[PDB]
Design a protein around this ligand. Structure first.
Ligand SMILES: Cc1cc2nc3c(=O)[nH]c(=O)nc-3n(C[C@H](O)[C@H](O)[C@H](O)COP(=O)(O)OP(=O)(O)OC[C@H]3O[C@@H](n4cnc5c(N)ncnc54)[C@H](O)[C@@H]3O)c2cc1C
Ligand SMILES: [Ca+2]
Ligand SMILES: [Ca+2]
Length: 430
């Protein structure tokens, strides 16, 4: 009979368990997978460890920065000054070669226009509903706003590619204010936000940081079998796995990805406001992909606008013997069959021309049954309902990026939610 069962060993569940353990409470962690990290994941590609889920971080993200400080992780610098070529692929398929300086000027000036109201709308962005106007703007799509700004062709296409990636969806579906909030969190500053999304990653890898947090937990651990049901009463909670084993505790922290709750039986059932959020709020259809090209392409970056499938194509490595390793982020995996190698290769040739594609490693996060969304992009009309999902239901408590006040599409939000849920249980037990 545990003080707390924590369901899920991604960043939010690990931080929750670390906080409760540090409070002297007894903790059981239950994880479906045989690994830590959740939607962060390190795998081998061509014998090199690569991040294939989330990994970009910045010190303007205070919760992940605090953990990096605690465990001694630094910021690894992406090779931006070394960038040789930048390309924009428009929605109609036309590709243009843009000097990086021009690309940065047009992109950042478009971003500033898109986010110009961030200080008005989000004076206290870690309390993002403080200005009630954001609840009424929730139903405006990112595309509705984008088209109101008088942007030029490159500004429009690059911003729409960015917003397609963040939404994991056509930009007609993304909540406009939910994205502007990230600008506000970055000190209402376009350079800081656009830096945050490209300049740094976790030195040593997200898996090592998860391991360090896990190693600080004094908890029992059960990996490899998913939770199938959760039942609570006035005196406790009982959690049943799909192999029919049963565990019991006074409280339960759920960190499941929002759409996965539909695969778990809750007794009593979750309230209507949570079931509505579970059905409608999330949508991100993302996947990640690494490709090996025989040719040495140098250090290139490509943005492709919707409905091109490869919204961002970054260069992980290049040299005259290796060729090139490309890191590709796909906002809408529905647009390409990632089991079809030659279809992947054809899209690489559309961008990079006369090249030979040798190997591909996709990770389809949307089709992963324990993820189902790549990151908690908020559908228009739903960003302002996130407290319906974050609030406790008696002995059940809820964490995960989607429940965060701040950086809700990020590792930082997952960590925030772990600190917060540890606080809620601290007081529930007082
Ligand atoms: C391709 C990609 C790019 C991204 N880029 C960035 C980025 O640059 N920077 C950034 O900060 N964030 C980024 N993100 C987002 C970030 O990775 C996630 O927001 C964050 O990792 C979510 O943490 P979490 O703890 O909320 O959820 P998760 O990590 O999903 O953890 C939930 C856990 O619950 C487990 N689980 C699911 N079902 C069950 C069940 N029935 N029983 C038991 N356990 C279960 C899952 O296995 C998982 O371990 C990216 C994500 C992806 C996929
Ligand atoms: Ca160079
Ligand atoms: Ca500003």
């Amino acid at each position: 009979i545990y003080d707390a069962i924590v369901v899920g060993a991604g960043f939010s569940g690990l931080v929750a368990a670390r906080e409760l353990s540090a409070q002297g409470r007894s903790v059981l962690i239950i994880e479906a997978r045989h690994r830590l990290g959740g939607r962060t994941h390190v795998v081998n590609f061509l014998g090199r460890p690569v991040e294939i889920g989330g990994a970009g971080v910045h010190w303007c993200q205070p919760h992940v920065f605090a953990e990096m400080q605690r465990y001694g992780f630094g910021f690894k610098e992406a090779p931006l000054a070394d960038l040789d070529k930048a390309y924009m692929v428009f929605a109609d398929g036309q590709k243009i070669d843009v000097p990086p300086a021009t690309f940065d000027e047009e992109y950042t000036t478009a971003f500033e226009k898109f986010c110009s109201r961030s200080r008005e709308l989000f004076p206290r962005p870690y309390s993002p509903l403080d200005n009630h106007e954001v609840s009424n703007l929730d139903g405006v799509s990112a595309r509705d706003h984008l088209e109101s700004l008088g942007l030029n062709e490159l500004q429009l296409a690059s911003m729409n590619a960015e917003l397609t990636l963040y939404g994991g969806a056509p930009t007609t579906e993304l909540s406009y204010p939910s994205f502007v909030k990230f600008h506000a969190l970055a000190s209402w500053d376009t350079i800081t936000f656009t830096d945050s999304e490209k300049r740094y990653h976790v030195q040593g890898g997200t898996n090592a940081l998860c391991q360090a947090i896990f190693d600080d937990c004094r908890a029992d651990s059960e990996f490899g079998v998913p939770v199938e049901a959760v039942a609570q009463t006035d005196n406790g909670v009982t959690v049943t796995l799909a192999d029919k084993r049963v565990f019991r505790a006074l409280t339960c922290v759920l960190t499941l990805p929002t759409k996965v709750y539909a695969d778990v039986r809750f007794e009593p059932p979750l309230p209507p406001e949570k079931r509505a959020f579970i059905e409608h709020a999330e949508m991100a259809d993302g996947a990640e992909l690494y490709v090996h090209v025989r040719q040495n392409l140098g250090n290139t970056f490509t943005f492709c606008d919707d409905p091109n499938p490869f919204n961002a194509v970054q260069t992980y490595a290049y040299d005259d013997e290796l060729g090139t390793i490309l890191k590709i982020t796909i906002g809408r995996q529905s647009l390409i069959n990632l089991e079809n190698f030659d279809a992947i290769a054809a899209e690489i040739r559309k961008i990079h021309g006369d090249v030979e594609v040798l190997e591909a490693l996709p990770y389809n996060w949307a089709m992963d049954e324990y993820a189902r969304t790549s990151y908690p992009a908020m559908r228009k009309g739903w960003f302002s309902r996130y407290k319906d999902m974050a609030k406790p239901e008696n002995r059940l408590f809820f964490a995960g990026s989607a429940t965060a006040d701040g950086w809700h599409e990020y590792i930082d939000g997952a960590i925030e939610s772990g600190i917060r849920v540890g606080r809620e249980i601290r007081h529930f037990m007082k």
